[PDB]
RNA sequence: AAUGGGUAAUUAUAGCGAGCUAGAAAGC
């Protein structure tokens, strides 16, 4: 099996600078056990097994199903979820518990239960002890913000 | 009945605890 490195680059940055900052990512992708699809940065180096089945079709599809059948929580909510996923001490688990429970009582009570299943999903895979689900959620929310940008 | 006096209780209670939008754009 193979090991990829995907780098995101802006408009018209030169291909000499572009083919080298991506060789770094695919040698960081070769910098674990067998293979990895090292995405955007030098971290985010997920194994392909705990990618496509687990990020690109599991977590991002549930993130996409939440924020497209729902109206009141927007990019500000996703921004704070990414911030809490990026910092992540134990105190941020407490702050995330307070935040999600506090916004659950701030929906329309016809949108409370869809939010409640999403709250339980995000709080379950924020505190999951595997350590992988937080990183996968962070990259999945990266992808969802990169889709919905105007 | 006189005369001397006041004595006790509560000292805030129940909530909201931020929300949304932007999350970098042009150039060299």
């Amino acid at each position: 099996t193979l090991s990829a490195g995907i780098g995101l680059f802006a408009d018209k940055t030169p291909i000499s600078l572009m083919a080298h900052q991506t060789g770094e990512l695919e040698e960081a992708a070769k910098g674990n056990e067998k293979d990895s699809i090292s995405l955007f940065s030098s971290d985010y180096t997920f194994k392909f097994d705990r990618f496509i089945t687990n990020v690109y079709d599991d977590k991002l599809e549930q993130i996409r199903y939440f924020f497209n059948h729902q109206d009141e929580r927007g990019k500000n909510f996703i921004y704070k979820l990414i911030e809490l996923l990026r910092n992540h001490d134990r105190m941020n688990m407490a702050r995330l518990a307070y935040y999600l429970t506090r916004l659950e009582e701030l929906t329309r009570e016809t949108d409370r239960d869809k939010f409640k299943t999403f709250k339980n999903l995000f709080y379950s895979w924020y505190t999951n002890k595997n350590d992988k689900d937080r990183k996968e959620a962070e990259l999945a929310l990266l992808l969802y913000i990169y889709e919905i940008r105007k």
Side-chain angles (χ1 to χ4, degrees), chain A residues 28-29 31-32 35-108:
Chain A
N32 59 9
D35 59 343
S36 289
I37 179 163
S38 173
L39 270 296
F40 306 154
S41 290
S42 295
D43 54 352
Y44 300 106
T45 69
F46 296 102
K47 195 87 173 296
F48 266 112
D49 294 332
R50 57 183 180 91
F51 190 71
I52 309 163
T53 71
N54 204 3
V55 178
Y56 189 70
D57 289 330
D58 191 2
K59 291 184 187 294
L60 182 60
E61 294 296 325
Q62 279 170 344
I63 295 165
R64 191 179 294 118
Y65 183 71
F66 177 71
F67 294 96
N68 288 117
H69 294 277
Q70 192 271 340
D71 194 80
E72 64 269 14
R73 304 297 93 194
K75 294 181 190 173
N76 196 3
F77 175 63
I78 312 169
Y79 190 84
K80 292 186 178 181
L81 296 176
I82 288 174
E83 173 181 359
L84 286 165
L85 280 163
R86 184 169 293 121
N87 297 314
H88 187 267
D89 55 352
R90 180 72 181 84
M91 186 60 208
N92 281 317
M93 296 179 186
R95 297 181 188 181
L96 192 270
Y98 183 76
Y99 175 67
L100 286 178
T101 306
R102 198 194 70 203
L103 299 181
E104 185 193 2
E105 59 96 26
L106 202 142
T107 57
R108 299 178 190 177

Side-chain angles (χ1 to χ4, degrees), chain A residues 96-130:
Chain A
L96 192 270
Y98 183 76
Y99 175 67
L100 286 178
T101 306
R102 198 194 70 203
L103 299 181
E104 185 193 2
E105 59 96 26
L106 202 142
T107 57
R108 299 178 190 177
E109 295 293 321
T110 181
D111 293 326
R112 190 194 180 96
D113 53 349
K114 291 174 69 69
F115 185 80
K116 186 177 177 178
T117 67
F118 181 72
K119 178 182 80 69
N120 295 326
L121 279 180
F122 190 82
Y123 191 76
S124 66
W125 66 64
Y126 189 84
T127 57
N128 208 2
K129 190 74 175 182
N130 300 117

